[PDB]
Amino acid sequence: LERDALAERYATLSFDVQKIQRAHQAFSQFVGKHLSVAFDTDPEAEIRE
Amino acid sequence: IQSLTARAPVWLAAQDTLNQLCEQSGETLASSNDVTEYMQQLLEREREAT
């Protein structure tokens, strides 16, 4: 009965760690494919002008 | 010509520091997407090291 709780809690913690790791992977993929034009000014506006 | 000239020293400084940064790195850079690819590789290595 005691060890059941530890298994459950460990499951949640491992899930959280995996979530963080994948979030870092996503940001790395992003910057690999993205910075060339990141945060630049909106072209729709200027074309309209 | 004036626009190209105003952009000339900016371009030259870009190339200069690009060469310096390229030499500071083991891998040699050749294109913008290549630069960003190297950057994400650098982040990956940093994460593993920490």
Side-chain angles (χ1 to χ4, degrees):
Chain A
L1 175 63
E2 173 57 21
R3 188 259 298 169
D4 293 337
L6 298 180
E8 181 293 3
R9 187 178 169 209
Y10 174 83
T12 63
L13 299 187
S14 65
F15 169 92
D16 180 41
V17 169
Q18 292 295 333
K19 187 181 176 181
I20 299 294
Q21 288 178 353
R22 182 153 169 130
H24 184 85
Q25 180 50 228
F27 273 99
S28 70
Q29 177 65 34
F30 166 100
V31 298
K33 162 265 181 180
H34 189 287
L35 270 283
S36 314
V37 188
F39 311 102
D40 199 13
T41 176
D42 184 346
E44 149 47 41
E46 304 177 2
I47 288 168
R48 155 201 41 51
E49 188 182 342
Chain B
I1 282 171
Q2 181 64 286
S3 305
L4 293 167
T5 302
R7 171 257 164 170
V10 184
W11 166 81
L12 186 57
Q15 299 304 102
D16 297 333
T17 192
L18 165 65
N19 301 326
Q20 177 278 306
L21 188 55
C22 183
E23 286 298 334
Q24 181 171 0
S25 294
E27 183 57 28
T28 182
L29 286 302
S31 59
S32 60
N33 56 359
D34 176 50
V35 160
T36 55
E37 281 299 336
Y38 179 83
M39 196 167 196
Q40 69 157 350
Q41 295 156 29
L42 191 70
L43 279 307
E44 293 280 38
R45 287 153 65 197
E46 199 275 350
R47 185 261 183 180
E48 297 314 311
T50 189

